Symmetry: D2
Subunit: 380 residues, 4 copies
């Protein structure tokens, strides 16, 4: 039974009328059966039929013991973070996403937790980083925007060697291309704001958990810090996940073709994309994933040319994130860090002229044609 076939099934047992869409329980409380006993549901912060339908499809998708839905990706990562106590340590790949950065830096500390940074690509570096009191190993792969690959099976054994939990933020791959729990991770997180919902109209975060005692501790925090995804947002996620395989299938192929057109373009200096045969990490990646994705970036050594591509293209929207049906284009180097000086950007592997693209589901000839016209209009 394929993913494609699994994403559209409606297994809503509770529904007496078998509607084709999951009924939306937009309520806060439920009436109890008696003065002494509760019902299956009582308060939405604790549990809700609609969110249960989504959390449950997502556990199957990730082959997890239990899945949890949060108001956003950051909320999911913040909860994970509230699992390490005072005097513990966290080995954080130092490449990891902006909000993840800010979190590991400015927030995790106020809690008496220690934060180690590394290059999860160098096993020795991460080997030396895994201390006695190391309780969490937190990875991302491909990284962004460079697409550098890390070995999740091995980093899993080093960490598991100290009795530590491995968190794999799979947002960039989604359950259709990768399933980290089957590579040794303990918790896979997905910003569902990206591929899962795929329409850039809903914030959501997902924690997919391996191990019951573990899941019980996540539920404790989803239910106590009250960050469970709202019923309406769950419904929009349920509606969107249905075409996830269909959308990734077209998107990724658009990305392959635009990466190839750019790869051999006179004005493009380098192209990062794990799908290119020439990508350092290519073979490593595909040993743990079925696809490169639909996000990639490139350099042009010319910041004035890069701004032009970004601002001139008619089919790409200038925006953050990726994974929507609309193709996006940006400069993470002078934008996704506008507060980044000349040393603030150099202190972060990236270069003022770097352009990142999130390919959508348009006709790739429309997109390649759009980019070509854009290079041919830049004056000198």
């Amino acid at each position: 039974a394929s993913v494609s076939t699994l994403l559209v099934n409606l297994d809503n047992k509770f529904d007496p009328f078998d509607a084709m869409s999951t009924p939306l329980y937009q309520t806060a409380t439920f009436k109890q059966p008696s003065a002494i006993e509760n019902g299956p549901y009582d308060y939405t912060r604790s549990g809700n039929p609609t969110r249960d339908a989504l959390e449950s499809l997502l556990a199957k998708l990730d082959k997890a013991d239990r899945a949890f839905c949060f108001t956003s990706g950051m909320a999911a990562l913040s909860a994970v973070t509230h699992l390490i106590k005072n005097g513990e340590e966290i080995v954080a790949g130092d490449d990891v996403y902006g909000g993840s950065d800010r979190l590991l830096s400015q927030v995790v500390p106020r809690s008496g937790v220690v934060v180690k940074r590394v290059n999860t690509t160098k096993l020795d570096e991460v080997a030396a980083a895994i201390g006695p009191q190391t309780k969490l190993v937190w990875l991302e792969s491909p990284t962004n925007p460079r697409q550098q690959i890390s070995d999740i099976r091995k980093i899993s054994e080093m960490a598991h060697a100290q009795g530590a939990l491995v968190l794999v933020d799979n947002s960039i791959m989604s359950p259709v291309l990768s399933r980290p729990l089957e590579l040794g991770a303990d918790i896979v997180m997905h910003s569902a704001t990206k591929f899962i919902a795929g329409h850039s109209d809903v914030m959501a975060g997902v924690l997919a958990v391996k191990g019951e005692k573990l899941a019980k501790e996540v539920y404790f925090l989803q239910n106590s810090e009250g960050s469970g995804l709202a019923p309406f947002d769950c419904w929009l996620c349920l509606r969107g996940i249905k075409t996830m395989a269909l959308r990734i299938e077209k998107q990724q192929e658009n990305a392959r073709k635009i990466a190839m057109y750019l790869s051999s373009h006179p004005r493009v200096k380098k192209v990062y994309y794990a799908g290119l045969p020439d990508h350092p990490g290519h073979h490593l990646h595909f040993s743990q994933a079925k696809g490169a994705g639909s996000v990639f970036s490139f350099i042009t050594g010319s910041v004035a040319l890069s701004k032009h591509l970004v601002e001139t293209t008619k089919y790409f929207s200038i925006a953050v994130s990726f994974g929507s049906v609309k193709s996006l284009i940006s400069m993470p180097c002078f934008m996704s860090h506008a507060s980044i000086p000349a040393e603030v950007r150099e202190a972060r592997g990236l270069t003022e002229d770097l352009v990142r693209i999130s390919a959508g589901i348009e006709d790739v000839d429309d997109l390649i044609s759009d980019l070509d016209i854009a290079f041919k209009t830049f004056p000198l």
Copy 2:
């Protein structure tokens, strides 16, 4: 300019078409204007027009500098909590609500933050408990379900003279009966799931802040822990908050009358309601609140008769919380702590037969008659 009157004010400067209802911005991202600069908005976790319209109304209602909306009441209490660093001190009443209790005993510790519990009605204790390390004082008055009154002006001065922040969870009072920031509090919090939304159909928390620095610090956390209330939810709060003054007016009056009836009823031992002249705290409370709200409880000395009133009443629903248009009834001891033993149930100031009622907006003659019959049908 009265509150009833302020609540229906539609202040949407952004909307070109002057809709009578605030346009719902159900979107996760916004397009940036150029490659270098951002727009007023960029990402719903960071900010959204619909949520801004609500956070603004809420700041005006509470006379706060800025207000913040969180995915739920607990999320809001959880952020205030992430303001206090490793090894600092938190002094919080003993009465403090269930979820707050749990958060105070099992999550705050994980940060090395120390928690002292006090009976905030006894100034000495408050005095005794507030040292050099105290950075947060956390009140709640009336207490649930006894409706104990604490002096908020005097507790604020003590803490401030110690440089501590004062939080008042004003959920049971809401903006139209009390505005704690004018009594020394620094942050007022509401479970907007209760009176603000008013229909039992949306989960939401609000944080009303005094002080630009503080606010900046609350915003920093609402944004990084990605917990701002979602747009559909903000829209439902905006919609339900409009009848807030109206709902409370009829509700409060209903509770008054129903306490009247129970107070002089032969099978009712004690009635807890701050509106009753005979209630310890009456004059204190009304010295800092324009009214006694709509939740109250009573004891009957008979766990068997209490269950009976609870299950037999035809017009009250057996449910958790309050502040909704529907009248609710429950038993905080044998229910809102159901899995509670003999001393583990009395380990909380509440005899297991205490019944709590949340008056709604129905005909009070229907509700009072509903209770009378239930008292008469009880088997001996």
Copy 3:
């Protein structure tokens, strides 16, 4: 069992989890149980659980056999209209609302259905106009904006003695002030866009029917012309209808007081409101309605002063319709028929300076003070 009390009753037999809010069935199709038989539901155009929950409440409020919800007020009036065959006769007041007017003069004719217009306050005319071909009598009392009262018990007997159906568009009264099916009417219609939903945010029409055959005939049309109100809309009506009794109570009282003030004001020539003792029809209306509602108008003999009151009032919005929590003000002559000439504007019983107000639920001292200032700032 009072109306205020009936409005919050949650009667959802179908829902397994007893949510406090009716589950929204946002779906177009339902799965059938076998290849041969259907289920309770199959297609939202045919029926939906959420819409059923509302159509049921509405039948109980109006003491009707069955009720139907349409995409809007006009859709409902348009269906009643599709009940009358080729070459039959329709007798409908002259006063009858704009959209109804248009529908009566430009669409009903296309069917060979003949339309006679009468001043339903003059029984003779009604008598004179009702022949052997009359199959529908269409009333509206009070009339807009003059608030003319027609005798609904006596008009029903005449038509019935001629075998004609009687429709009463009860939009301005709603179920808590009048229930026309207990006065001889056969179908009562409401623009649920007005008092029922009560927040200016949903378009909806309701048809409350007396008689199984008739109902069957209305259902046949709601179903075939695919016009039943959509599920999200039904849910918003269910949500807003709960404060209906509460909203009207404060609203009606507000209108009373504001008519009081204007009636004895030096710059106001005539005030039209059926609650005023001096109003022709007072005793008739209150002989068939429990109240005068919240819409009324006044003349000032000065088109220039009327525009001024309309544009200067700070607390009234310039807008069409009524029944919302927000106070509205407008000029039916120079606005709700703006593109109206000199005799084409007087070709409707309304002097071009008539101002209509719809009282909302704000502080009446705020509203009355708002009007006073506007009378005082008017340039001479």
Copy 4:
């Protein structure tokens, strides 16, 4: 600029914040600028920014002068029908859809309009059917479930020859495969409940019009009979139309492969599908369309085998309609007419054992495998 690329573009001029998703104007009224003049919007029944964004994308998709959105497909067809006056005629292909049937039969008549039926495949039949006073020619192609083809260019000239309007109900093809306005039709109707929204969670109907005076007459009825699609439903339509090209592309290909597997299956007697080279009409169809679609049917001469396939398959849902991401299966012969006797089904070209499939976007091997197992389990 391809359709695929056009379906995801956001051309919302009015939006000051450029959200990626169209802002939802869930309101009924808008405030007017002054006492004498309206704004662009005033009442949702008349016009709404969100519906305008959808009606406008749909005009581009169909190459129409203006597009209109209705509460449902039937509402769209019912409005079309209110365009022919008393004493006019309608030439209705007699094969046309159920609700279309019911309408042409039981409703259109009460209006003094004459109804002719034909086999739009026989030009002579339709030649003889086009009278002097014929104002509407109403087609469907492929028909359902037979997929019989009609020539839309020629039937367009015969009709236009009498000054008549041609209505083409394109629901089964959608704008991605066919655009009838470019073949002589005047109005193309789409049940948007099908392919446009594609998630079976929203009812909607669409009229795409050629000719301004024409469009003005449709707007008159959408605006007067109040059947304009609700803002929320428009938003769900906007969200769904975005993957329409992506969904039809996979769906149609699944259909091709399942039609081919069934075509050569021992237990299948006939397969109707315009994409099969062997289909009477094949070449005719593709002269006016780019694809066969994803709906087809087949016969097995065995009603007991057909029920079994329908009720045994694990990946097909038993439901009406088509065009959703979920594959559907049914027997229109003994189900989509359960009230169809032994002569009531014979009086309608179809046969008790006929099975219709609407292919979804699953893995076609999952679906073919599911059907094969189903044939191999039927006992004798």
